[PDB]
Design a protein around this nucleic acid. Structure first.
Ligand SMILES: [Zn+2]
Ligand SMILES: [Zn+2]
Ligand SMILES: [Zn+2]
Lengths: 78, 179, 96, 233, 103, 96, 102, 94, 78
DNA sequence: CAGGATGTATATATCTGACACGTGCCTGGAGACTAGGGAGTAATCCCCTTGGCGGTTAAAACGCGGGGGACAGCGCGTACGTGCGTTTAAGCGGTGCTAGAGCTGTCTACGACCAATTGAGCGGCCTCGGCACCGGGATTCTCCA
DNA sequence: TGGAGAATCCCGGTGCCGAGGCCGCTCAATTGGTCGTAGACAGCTCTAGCACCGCTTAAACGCACGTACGCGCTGTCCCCCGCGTTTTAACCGCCAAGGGGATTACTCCCTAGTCTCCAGGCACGTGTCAGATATATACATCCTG
């Protein structure tokens, strides 16, 4: 559905504040939601591919870590 | 909408189709006119193999577009699988290449099939690029164009450098003179 | 009637969120986003809590790095605000 | 404007010659093969020019001209005009001090094709032979322009309508090099607004070998009395 | 124990087992796990020492992810070794660009 | 006396080229580029299948692990047609 | 008589002509022998009396030229972003910063 | 009644007690350190594996590990790591 | 000194293949510095491979593998 | 003023370097058979995922005034593009010399491998203190008179 | 600039659950034999890399010129920020099924290793052709009498 709007404007503003951004154009929010949709689509796709190969029905934390590892954005602590 | 379908033998047939038509439908139309069974048909457009389920609209296929027809070959260990690439050599490289303790029997056949398919796809794009530039010998430049002009192969090969290949002709719009 | 100037609150928030270490996206909306994206690949998928946390961590870190480089592009263009074409430039330089 | 306001012929007119419109040069180049671009036309009957005269076509942006028939646009490519003669409208006005002017006949839009300077292209020893025979014969008007640094052009023998011009310290047109059929050629183009009636006179930028030129009759405060070139050859 | 004989805290036996069962080579030299354990001990010791220092610099005696993050990013060579690495719950360095500071 | 038997994918790439476009040749340097490409794709798929076997505590690379590696490596329609070709190959091979 | 020098090409026209010529061809743009001397000088600081195969120097020249061409492509995109048409050192430093090489 | 899941926890803890006298470490930080050690182990072992393959060797010796360490660690880190490796092998052969 | 052997016209040509239209005079020193860093890293890794293999000549395969290690794999040499 | 020798552009039969195809040979691939262990499948358990509910309250949504920063035009000067002429290393070919890559032979040290053993290390549970949170004052920063 | 005001920081007080340690156990680590192929090493061959040299000429270089583009300033205007008020839904704690991950039991087929055999693939001659080159040849230039 339209649940991608759950990532709201002030949360994106918070991420931007953590990134060092001082002023934010109104179109940045829709652009960031689209970019995040693409990114998460790729990572969840790789995760689901690992999960379906392992003959499991739950995407585990290791599948997500290995998926991130495949894209050179390795994550420590899971 | 008029479109053309070009065979590798160079024959073109003309179809009348709509944006709502699926690729399955187009193959059916091609069988009617040309006689080729759909299962043997492989269509390429904009450097993309076309998915039976999708519509011409999904691919932004418009009036007078040309789709390229390639036929998919149905039918020594290599001859048993109908492949050109060496299943045996792949099996040896897998066993003595230190990838796993054991190697399945279907793994070299599957891997050789994937390697031959990718090799055929890139050599086909390179051949088309060379023929469109009026040359008969494939050169590194044509391989470079084949890779960088096909979005999917570009994605797969974004961090590789093809020797003596140069770059795609790409001039920024802003560099051109004004009104 | 005592108001801060348009921008000092931004800097105080920058120091605050760069000082703290916590996920900045709301947990349940992000989990609904994850499950929605996962629906189009396989039906009735289950997720471990740690997998959703790992996804949220990677998502926040990737966005933070993207916004930092977008900010460097903005400052490079003699501005202090970010525009969509700055994000598109940053992602283009990165290689997508 | 209308400053150079009975038009004259070409062969109150100037000295006689033969009107040419093709390549009738001495021997010859440019060696730059312009390949068939993928320019979108918007052309079937002439609703819009295919390789447009002021739009973003890659051939026209670099002073390169498509050959007729091999570009993807076919024959409606407006960047073919040296091979199809889409010239402007000038005429030959007699002036008692400026000599012969190319008076504009229609009010001309700025930054467009006006005309082409075509003649005989020759090299340096035959070129100084032409110089010596002409100033021993006693002509008072000299057309010893240089296409490139090596070759030279001359139009008093077999030229066209581009002869009837002069030097003005305030130019209205200008001349720029283009390439057509692997042949380096010259074209005179406007830059400012051009009204029907005034002579189209540009900067010669001559390096005359003589000592006494005719004075610049432009009459402007930008004129130093003489023309002004680069070197004192 | 081979660990005490080599003067290492990391388990050379465990490293050797992971090397044999890890499909890296058909044969694994005896000096290889000792050398690898030594290199792992050095990298671990450097990161832990810097995180500890940062933790004392934040008046904490327990190392938390933020301190590991500060430790990694303030060492140029570790930053180069870990340029594609993301530390969970680590955050970002306090870096504010000069152009945004008030004038 | 000959120097040394060195293997390459030269003749197979040439047979594929003659199967898809019989009147087209290929330069020696281009054949080298194609050989490096085939070895590269091979190394990537074998490495990913190795990691898949390792992560799931298995010591056998079967056609399933190669299939999953293919689905991970090729972006989209390339993966769909690669899986189709591999399925055809394995089916015809084991059923003859 | 006299030589009559006409107007030259406007700045950028010959530049764009070079753009099209070098994007259409494939020859190496760096002089081979000076680059080889550069390679041997850089290699000097690791092992004395190092020898190189010609194919190694050629692979280095290809890699070097491809890396610089890609860097200048990214620099041109960031430059054109900033409403200029002239690349500056800041542009290359920004490109390297975003790429993660700095 | 639980599967044995190995870790590097106790060894990272030993190293922490040898370098910092009065300092503890959280569970999440220990998890990060454990994944980091497994990551660096995978990198070094993979590099040694491909290095052995390139040179038509079938054995990972001290030489391959040494060259892989010099390849992966930048500068001063590499210098001290090769010092530690040589020291350890010297002590172990004695 | 040999880093100046990669002359200014050659650097201009390199930019020309990249689509650059105008080049500031200060670019050339930055470009030679970038070239020095890149060649230093690749040559250093190549020399590390030669020292491992007990060979005195930097071979093409060593350069290809060194480049591949830095995520800039090169086709056409083996 | 005059032809002959000479310089120049043109079309040309030919020369070169890279590619397609035939030749001998050898080593690795294919076929056949056996053993053992990884994995496939049935069966059971129980952790932790999913779903729900209810109260809290903090963050998100929303609205509005306003200011300062984005954007566009203008103007200005200087630096970079183009071009010409001068020079110099780049390139090519030709020649010579030897270092070292590449292959082989022989041998041995070193690691695979296997069985027995035992303690290191892991799961479970248990404890107390560092820290998370809160309240109150203190400092610190910001902004408008 | 200084006083007001908001925000944040510091400093003690309480609670709590997770770090850190111990206890029992088991299987993986260690030791000792036993062996078999990888590799270390010496030697030899032959390719190719480096060094030099002459010659030709294409690109680099330095300067001159000029224009157009970078950069600073100024005006406008509009959009996003600060903040207050209202609302909604995240969140936290608790509970209830139950699905499916993980382990067990046991079987069995698939793949490593070995042995036997021969032809497919690789190095190498041999022939053939885009593309560059020295050469007959027509027309204009100088060249001396
Ligand atoms: Zn065009
Ligand atoms: Zn055209
Ligand atoms: Zn004048």
């Amino acid at each position: 559905r339209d649940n991608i709007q759950g990532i709201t404007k002030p949360a994106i503003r918070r991420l931007a504040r953590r990134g060092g951004v001082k002023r934010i154009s109104g179109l940045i929010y829709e652009e960031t939601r689209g970019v995040l949709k693409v990114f998460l689509e790729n990572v969840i796709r790789d995760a689901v591919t690992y999960t379906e190969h392992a003959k499991r029905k739950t995407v585990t934390a290791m599948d997500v870590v290995y998926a991130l590892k495949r894209q050179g954005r390795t994550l420590y602590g899971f | 909408m008029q479109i053309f379908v070009k065979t590798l033998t160079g024959k073109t047939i003309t179809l009348e189709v709509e944006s709502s038509d699926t690729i399955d439908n187009v193959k059916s139309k091609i069988q009617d006119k040309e006689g080729i069974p759909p299962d043997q048909q492989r269509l390429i457009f904009a450097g993309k193999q076309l998915e039976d389920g999708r519509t011409l609209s999904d691919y932004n296929i418009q009036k007078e577009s040309t789709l390229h027809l390639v036929l998919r070959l149905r039918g020594g260990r290599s001859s048993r699988a109908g492949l050109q690439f060496p299943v045996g050599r792949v099996h040896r490289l897998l066993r003595k290449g230190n990838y796993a303790e054991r190697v399945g029997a279907g793994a070299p056949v599957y891997l050789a099939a994937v390697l031959e398919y990718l090799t055929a796809e890139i050599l086909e794009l390179a051949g088309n690029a060379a023929r469109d530039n009026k040359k008969t010998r494939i050169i590194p430049r044509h391989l470079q164009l084949a890779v960088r002009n096909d979005e999917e192969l570009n994605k797969l090969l974004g961090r590789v450098t093809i020797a003596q290949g140069g770059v795609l002709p790409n001039i920024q719009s802003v560099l051109l003179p004004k009104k | 009637p005592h108001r801060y100037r348009p921008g000092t609150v931004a800097l105080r928030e920058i120091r605050r969120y760069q000082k703290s270490t916590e996920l900045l996206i709301r947990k349940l909306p992000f989990q609904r986003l994850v499950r929605e994206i996962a629906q189009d690949f396989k039906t009735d998928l289950r997720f471990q809590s740690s997998a959703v946390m790992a996804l949220q961590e990677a998502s926040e870190a990737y966005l933070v790095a993207l916004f930092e480089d977008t900010n460097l592009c903005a400052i490079h263009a003699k501005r202090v605000t970010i525009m969509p074409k700055d994000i598109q430039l940053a992602r283009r330089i990165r290689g997508e | 404007s209308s400053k150079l306001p009975p038009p004259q012929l070409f062969n109150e007119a100037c000295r006689t010659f033969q009107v040419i419109s093709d390549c009738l040069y001495g021997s010859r180049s440019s060696d730059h093969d312009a390949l068939d671009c993928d320019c979108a036309e918007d052309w079937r009957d002439g609703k819009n020019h295919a390789c447009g005269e002021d739009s973003d076509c890659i051939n026209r942006a670099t002073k390169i001209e498509c050959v007729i028939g091999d570009c993807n646009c076919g024959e409606g490519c407006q960047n073919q005009r040296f091979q199809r003669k889409q010239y402007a409208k000038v005429s030959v006005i007699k002036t008692e001090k400026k000599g012969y002017g190319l008076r504009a006949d229609t009010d001309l839009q700025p930054n467009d094709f006006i005309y082409e300077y075509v003649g005989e292209v020759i090299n340096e020893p035959t070129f100084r032979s032409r110089m010596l025979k002409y100033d021993k014969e006693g002509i008072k008007h000299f057309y010893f322009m240089s296409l490139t640094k090596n070759e030279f052009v001359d139009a008093t023998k077999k030229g066209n309508l581009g002869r009837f011009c002069n030097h003005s310290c305030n130019p209205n047109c200008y001349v720029d090099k283009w390439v057509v059929g692997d042949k380096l050629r010259m074209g005179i183009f406007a830059a400012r607004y051009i009204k029907a009636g005034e002579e189209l006179v540009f900067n010669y930028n001559v390096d005359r070998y003589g000592a006494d030129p005719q004075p610049c009759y432009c009459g402007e405060p930008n004129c130093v009395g003489f023309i002004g070139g680069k070197t004192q050859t | 124990g081979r660990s005490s004989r080599a003067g290492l805290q990391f388990p050379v036996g465990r490293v050797h087992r992971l090397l044999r069962k890890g499909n890296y080579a058909e044969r694994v030299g005896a000096g290889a796990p000792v050398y690898l354990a030594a290199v792992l001990e050095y990298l671990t010791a450097e990161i832990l020492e810097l995180a500890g220092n940062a933790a004392r610099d934040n008046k904490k005696t327990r190392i938390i992810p933020r301190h590991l993050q500060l430790a990694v990013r303030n060492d140029e060579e570790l930053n180069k070794l870990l340029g594609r690495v993301t530390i969970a719950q680590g955050g970002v360095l306090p870096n504010i660009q000069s152009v945004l500071l008030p004038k | 006396r000959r120097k040394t038997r060195k293997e390459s994918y030269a003749i197979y790439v040439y047979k594929v080229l003659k199967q898809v476009h019989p009147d087209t040749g290929i330069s020696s340097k281009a054949m080298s580029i194609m050989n490096s490409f085939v070895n590269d794709v091979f190394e990537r798929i074998a490495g990913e299948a190795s990691r898949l076997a390792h992560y799931n505590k298995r010591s056998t690379i079967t056609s399933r692990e190669i299939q999953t590696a293919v689905r991970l490596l090729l972006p989209g329609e390339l993966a769909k047609h690669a899986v189709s070709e591999g399925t055809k190959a394995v089916t015809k091979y084991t059923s003859a």
